Amino acid sequence: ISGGDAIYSSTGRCSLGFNVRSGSTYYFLTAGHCTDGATTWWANSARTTVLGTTSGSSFPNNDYGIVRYTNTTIPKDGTVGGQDITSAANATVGMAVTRRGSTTGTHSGSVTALNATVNYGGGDVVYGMIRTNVCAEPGDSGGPLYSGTRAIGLTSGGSGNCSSGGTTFFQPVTEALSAYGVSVY
Amino acid sequence: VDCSEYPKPACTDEYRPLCGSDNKTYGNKCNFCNAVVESNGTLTLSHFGKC
């Protein structure tokens, strides 16, 4: 399984952001809004293939969560679909980026601004977000934003859609890696 | 679902579908509710889950 693939929790479907590890322990990053109140995650709608269980969740304020893999046999590729990812970097204004998610597949665009505050309502405000002109739709949450082989963000949310165009905000991946002491591979 | 707190300028992208009266499956409550607003209150919820 790799970046962009669907993940299911007891509540819904999100996307796997990046496979990460610390020492010999493998995890996957995804959106905090998807990890919030979820415990176990599966690879299919039938919930037959277990992936693992939530190990951390930061949402609102931030929007990241990490799940520890309990599934021993499933391949955990260090890619986004077929794309290799080899490092992580900070987004810059003007940067060409690409998103992959479980509903809309792959879509490209550019970073238009940094340190954006997105107010999802009801007290759910997230801060320090990367703004871009890439679309995203429901189910795309937590998928990877990358540039070439560089990991850059996790899909959090936005407006519009892929038909008519939209704005999507991503959580900087670097912050998540730092918080959990993990790294891409 | 109550759409009074709408509209909202952004929606998170988790998928938990709702079936609108336009026979369109809405990806999540936030999306559905912004549609209701945009329809000026004409769109209703048909039922939970995919259409």
Curated annotation (Swiss-Prot), chain A:
The keyword Signal applies. Disulfide bonds join 14-34, 135-162. It is an enzyme of class 3 (hydrolase). Keywords: Disulfide bond, Hydrolase, Protease, Serine protease, Signal, Zymogen. The keyword Acyltransferase does not apply. It comes from the Bacteria. The active site is at 33 (charge relay system), 63 (charge relay system), 141 (charge relay system). Its EC number is 3.4.21.81. GO terms for biological process: proteolysis. GO terms for cellular component: extracellular region. It catalyses: Hydrolysis of proteins with trypsin-like specificity. GO terms for molecular function: serine-type endopeptidase activity. Has a primary specificity for large aliphatic or aromatic amino acids. Belongs to the peptidase S1 family. Monomer. This is Streptogrisin-B.
Swiss-Prot record, chain B:
Glycans are attached at residue 40. Residues 1-51 form the Kazal-like domain. Keywords: Disulfide bond, Glycoprotein, Protease inhibitor, Repeat, Secreted, Serine protease inhibitor. Disulfide bonds join 3-33, 11-30, 19-51. Avian ovomucoid consists of three homologous, tandem Kazal family inhibitory domains. Transmembrane segments: none annotated. It comes from the Eukaryota. The record marks 13-14 as: Reactive bond 3 for chymotrypsin, elastase, proteases A and B, and subtilisin. It is found in: Secreted. The lineage of its organism: Eukaryota, Metazoa, Chordata, Craniata, Vertebrata. One of its GO terms (molecular function) is serine-type endopeptidase inhibitor activity. GO terms for cellular component: extracellular region. This is Ovomucoid. The keyword Secreted applies. The keyword Repeat applies.
